[PDB]
Amino acid sequence: PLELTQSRVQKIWVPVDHRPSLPRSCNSPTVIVMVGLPARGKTYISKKLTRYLNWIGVPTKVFNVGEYRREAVKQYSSYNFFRPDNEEAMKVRKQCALAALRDVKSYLAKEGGQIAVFDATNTTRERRHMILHFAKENDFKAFFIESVCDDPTVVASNIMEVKISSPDYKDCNSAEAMDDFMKRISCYEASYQPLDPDKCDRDLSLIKVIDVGRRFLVNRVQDHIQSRIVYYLMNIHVQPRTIYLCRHGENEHNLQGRIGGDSGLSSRGKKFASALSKFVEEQNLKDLRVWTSQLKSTIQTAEALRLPYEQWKALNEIDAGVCEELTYEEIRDTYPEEYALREQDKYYYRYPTGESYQDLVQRLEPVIMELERQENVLVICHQAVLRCLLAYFLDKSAEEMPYLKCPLHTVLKLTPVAYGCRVESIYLNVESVCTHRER
Amino acid sequence: PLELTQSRVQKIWVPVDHRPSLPRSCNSPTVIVMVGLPARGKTYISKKLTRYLNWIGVPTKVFNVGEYRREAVKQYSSYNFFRPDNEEAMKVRKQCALAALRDVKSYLAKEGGQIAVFDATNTTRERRHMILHFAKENDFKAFFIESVCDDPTVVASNIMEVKISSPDYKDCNSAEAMDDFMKRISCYEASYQPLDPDKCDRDLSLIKVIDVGRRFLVNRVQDHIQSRIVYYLMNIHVQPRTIYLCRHGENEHNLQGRIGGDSGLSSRGKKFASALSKFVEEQNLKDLRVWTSQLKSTIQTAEALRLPYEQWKALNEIDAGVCEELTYEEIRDTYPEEYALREQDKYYYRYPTGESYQDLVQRLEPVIMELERQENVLVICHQAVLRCLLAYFLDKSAEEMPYLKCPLHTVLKLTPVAYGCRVESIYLNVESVCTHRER
Ligand SMILES: Cn1cc(-c2c[nH]c3ccc(Oc4ccc(NC(=O)CN)cc4)cc23)cn1
Ligand SMILES: Cn1cc(-c2c[nH]c3ccc(Oc4ccc(NC(=O)CN)cc4)cc23)cn1
Numbered sequence: 001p002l003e004l005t006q007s008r009v010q011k012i013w014v015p016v017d018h019r020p021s022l023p024r025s026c027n028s029p030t031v032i033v034m035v036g037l038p039a040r041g042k043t044y045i046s047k048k049l050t051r052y053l054n055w056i057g058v059p060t061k062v063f064n065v066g067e068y069r070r071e072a073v074k075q076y077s078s079y080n081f082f083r084p085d086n087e088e089a090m091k092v093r094k095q096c097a098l099a100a101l102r103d104v105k106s107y108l109a110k111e112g113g114q115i116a117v118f119d120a121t122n123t124t125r126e127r128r129h130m131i132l133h134f135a136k137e138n139d140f141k142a143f144f145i146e147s148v149c150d151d152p153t154v155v156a157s158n159i160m161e162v163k164i165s166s167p168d169y170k171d172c173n174s175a176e177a178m179d180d181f182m183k184r185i186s187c188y189e190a191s192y193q194p195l196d197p198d199k200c201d202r203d204l205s206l207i208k209v210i211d212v213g214r215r216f217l218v219n220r221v222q223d224h225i226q227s228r229i230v231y232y233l234m235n236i237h238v239q240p241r242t243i244y245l246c247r248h249g250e251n252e253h254n255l256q257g258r259i260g261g262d263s264g265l266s267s268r269g270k271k272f273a274s275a276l277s278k279f280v281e282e283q284n285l286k287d288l289r290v291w292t293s294q295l296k297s298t299i300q301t302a303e304a305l306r307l308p309y310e311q312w313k314a315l316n317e318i319d320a321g322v323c324e325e326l327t328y329e330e331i332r333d334t335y336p337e338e339y340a341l342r343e344q345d346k347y348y349y350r351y352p353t354g355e356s357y358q359d360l361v362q363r364l365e366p367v368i369m370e371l372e373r374q375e376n377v378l379v380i381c382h383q384a385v386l387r388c389l390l391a392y393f394l395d396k397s398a399e400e401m402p403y404l405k406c407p408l409h410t411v412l413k414l415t416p417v418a419y420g421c422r423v424e425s426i427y428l429n430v431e432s433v434c435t436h437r438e439r
Numbered sequence: 440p441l442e443l444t445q446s447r448v449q450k451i452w453v454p455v456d457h458r459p460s461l462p463r464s465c466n467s468p469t470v471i472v473m474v475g476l477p478a479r480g481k482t483y484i485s486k487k488l489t490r491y492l493n494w495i496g497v498p499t500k501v502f503n504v505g506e507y508r509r510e511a512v513k514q515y516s517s518y519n520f521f522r523p524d525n526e527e528a529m530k531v532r533k534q535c536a537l538a539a540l541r542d543v544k545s546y547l548a549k550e551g552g553q554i555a556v557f558d559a560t561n562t563t564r565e566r567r568h569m570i571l572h573f574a575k576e577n578d579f580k581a582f583f584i585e586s587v588c589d590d591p592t593v594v595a596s597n598i599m600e601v602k603i604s605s606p607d608y609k610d611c612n613s614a615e616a617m618d619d620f621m622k623r624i625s626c627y628e629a630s631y632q633p634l635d636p637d638k639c640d641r642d643l644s645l646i647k648v649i650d651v652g653r654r655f656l657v658n659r660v661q662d663h664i665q666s667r668i669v670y671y672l673m674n675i676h677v678q679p680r681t682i683y684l685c686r687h688g689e690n691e692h693n694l695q696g697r698i699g700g701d702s703g704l705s706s707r708g709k710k711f712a713s714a715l716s717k718f719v720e721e722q723n724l725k726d727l728r729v730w731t732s733q734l735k736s737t738i739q740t741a742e743a744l745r746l747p748y749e750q751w752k753a754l755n756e757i758d759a760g761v762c763e764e765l766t767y768e769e770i771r772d773t774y775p776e777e778y779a780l781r782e783q784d785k786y787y788y789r790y791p792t793g794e795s796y797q798d799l800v801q802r803l804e805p806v807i808m809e810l811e812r813q814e815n816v817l818v819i820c821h822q823a824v825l826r827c828l829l830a831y832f833l834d835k836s837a838e839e840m841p842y843l844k845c846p847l848h849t850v851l852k853l854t855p856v857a858y859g860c861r862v863e864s865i866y867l868n869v870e871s872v873c874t875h876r877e878r
């Protein structure tokens with residue numbers, strides 16, 4: 001009894017499965033409901049939350065009712081389409097919401113999706129009662145995220161940043177698009193019934209994000225994922241800042257083509273460290289937090305900056321287990337089965353007594369949460385760690401992640417803009433070996 | 440340039456410190472303010488939060504004004520001491536609060552304390568304005584935690600569970616103590632001014648815990664620690680449950696006196712696994728979550744239960760680095776310097792390319808957060824992992840933690856009661872080797 005086998009790729013101990021003569025094949029999804037008037041950052045919340053949930057391994061998809069509308073109604077003319085007295089467009093808009101819900105059902109019940117973010121105004125109790133009915137009948141959980149903001153400066157900024165550039169306003173100039181959008185918001189104000197956790201919405205699971213995250217009303221958080229979302233929303237901010245990501249300067253193991261270890265900077269690596277200090281100085285940042293791993297090469301690179309820095313064990317390079325300090329040639333010759341398994345499944349593959357890219361994500365989640373809280377940050381890390389962090393910021397899949405290009409002596413400058421990061425690459429003109437290996 | 444040395448105990452790379460001829464020695468603390476009427480679980484929140492913060496490595500202390508009062512006023516007679524018209528006792532109570540604040544200043548500014556939990560009613564704006572003045576003048580941050588509850592069943596339950604058993608009610612019977620405490624609560628109701636984040640307390644950093652954690656009002660979370668507290672308060676619950684903790688059944692490495700590795704159950708270990716299944720069955724639990732590490736020995740133990748289980752990489756035994764699969768005799772003979780360093784500083788000591796008990800805490804924090812969310816849970820883990828989890832539940836220090844007794848083939852049954860866990864040990868009558876080593 002208790003006979004187990006270790007799975008070759010992930011290295012997971014499973015019961016030996018001696019399937020009989022005729023082998024037989026043999027928790028609840030969530031609908032996240034966005035609530036609020038237009039230009040309240042609902043799409044911003046939807047997209048950022050989906051990016052985070054997918055990166056941590058929770059399959060998530062956004063269903064934006066406006067995109068179903070742009071598909072059903074070819075060209076957008078004006079706010080007149082959104083008028084409450086527009087009988088025809090009101091029918092079309094309802095059909096679009098129902099078509100999005102149909103796709104929500106298919107995603108969660110038939111495609112292995114775990115979270116569906118229903119991105120619409122959902123400003124009336126009637127619409128929300130209909131979404132609740134849809135969730136109850138399909139055995140889906142419902143979690144409401146309402147964004148409430150009365151600041152006209154914030155509303156005008158959102159229109160200027162991401163609304164005027166919408167495909168709806170292609171033939172319009174900035175002034176007419178802004179004016180049309182203000183009229184469009186006014187169409188929703190009369191029927192808008194905010195969430196009432198005090199009386200009406202007392203039994204609903206919800207978060208009210210008030211005044212661009214200054215205040216929060218949290219009601220009946222049922223589970224782990226809702227609690228995580230709430231914690232995430234409370235850590236993110238919309239303040240302007242820059243994230244600089246780079247690897248340690250070239251090390252002695254890099255020169256020998258050896259993986260892992262705790263080797264020091266080569267002469268070129270030390271030159272990069274000096275070049276990085278000059279680069280950092282030229283950026284003229286009021287305050288800058290510097291984060292390193294606990295491995296020597298990243299600390300030596302930070303030492304050249306003459307700035308305070310913090311060492312994180314979570315930033316340490318992927319653990320290669322038995323393959324640590326070996327070259328890839330020595331891995332292929334000593335462990336050919338292991339080498340081929342990794343090449344076939346680079347994300348899920350776990351090194352013996354070591355890690356996978358999947359393990360890295362789990363380790364890096366507190367790093368991501370702290371990066372969100374912070375402003376200007378410089379992260380000096382390692383190739384696999386950098387690919388993982390970059391996949392979060394650039395919304396790259398688990399399959400793409402182990403192959404992202406993160407060259408040595410190159411700074412990745414990340415600027416948060418619209419619904420994602422602008423990425424600028426800055427090579428600091430110091431030669432190094434190449435550690436990138438394609439599939 | 441960039442000359443570093445690796446610290447012998449923690450294995451941290453530090454700049455080589457060539458101190459000159461005359462060597463010279465060369466963030467803001469927080470006051471957590473509890474707010475609310477008596478029997479609102481303020482002391483329960485204070486104690487649990489302090490236990491969690493200390494375990495994660497944030498030095499925290501509770502300053503309970505009632506304990507300063509029991510010290511100043513020898514014997515407690517009745518609610519008459521708490522009367523608003525009691526001029527003398529009102530002076531004494533103020534002096535006690537000021538004496539507690541004096542000790543808060545000394546703890547945070549002179550003893551290396553990071554968080555001071557000011558556990559009092561702090562029901563008036565006047566008292567809170569005075570605490571704010573004290574925080575501003577000492578450069579301390581202020582974070583308010585208010586517990587609001589109108590349920591008379593909850594109030595009566597709190598009085599019966601932990602108030603009637605208070606040193607104040609030693610000479611009283613349950614009925615008179617309950618009656619006196621109800622009158623005592625009434626003394627505070629007239630002057631009680633709840634936190635108003637809408638108008639008056641808009642600029643204060645606060646959390647309102649409403650109806651025993653059913654709802655939360657979160658205002659202006661400034662930093663990392665406040666955000667963590669909020670997340671913790673949202674994950675904990677007061678629902679009745681049991682936590683069972685045990686190690687995997689005896690393994691082959693245990694028999695050889697070898698550390699780490701991924702060996703399977705010995706014949707005795709398999710006998711424990713059967714004994715554990717019978718024990719679990721006899722507990723008659725409606726639902727039970729079973730958690731294991733990703734190491735074979737814990738999975739084989741769970742396999743004997745015939746219950747669904749979840750494997751956590753965070754539950755894997757402490758990593759011994761270069762000392763993995765070695766006996767302690769082989770460690771002392773091959774690495775005598777390393778052996779002696781560990782014996783001297785067992786909590787902070789890091790194995791080369793391995794971990795410390797300090798690293799274990801960081802890894803286990805998500806385990807603790809999930810244990811808090813759950814109800815009936817059985818954790819099948821390893822000696823060092825178990826000591827770490829037990830130190831959290833039993834409020835043991837970093838210094839005590841590496842020496843806690845966690846024998847093989849023994850279940851630790853944890854029952855949450857009053858202000859901490861009741862611990863019952865259940866030996867399942869199966870022989871094994873002893874892996875415990877005293878200082
Ligand atoms: C850059 N940008 C901001 C908006 C924007 C306009 N109104 C909004 C309303 C909500 C919103 O989401 C959040 C904002 C803040 C936070 N939590 C915090 O801050 C807590 N420390 C969470 C979500 C974004 C916007 C659009 N573009
Ligand atoms: C066992 N006991 C409960 C009380 C008690 C009486 N009123 C209280 C008021 C507050 C309180 O703290 C919290 C309760 C719940 C939660 N968060 C959740 O639930 C969220 N999922 C956080 C703190 C405890 C008590 C006393 N003893």
Ligand SMILES: O=P(O)(O)OC[C@H]1O[C@](O)(CO)[C@@H](O)[C@@H]1O
Nearest residue numbers: 259260317320382383384435437
């Ligand atoms: O996942 P890949 O492509 O092997 O890259 C990760 C490797 O890169 C390095 O950082 C440098 O080669 C190694 O330490 C690590 O094993």
Ligand SMILES: O=P(O)(O)OC[C@H]1O[C@](O)(CO)[C@@H](O)[C@@H]1O
Nearest residue numbers: 698699756759821822823874876
């Ligand atoms: O910290 P200590 O006392 O060495 O105990 C931890 C050790 O106990 C074991 O679980 C069993 O001896 C080892 O795997 C591990 O190294």
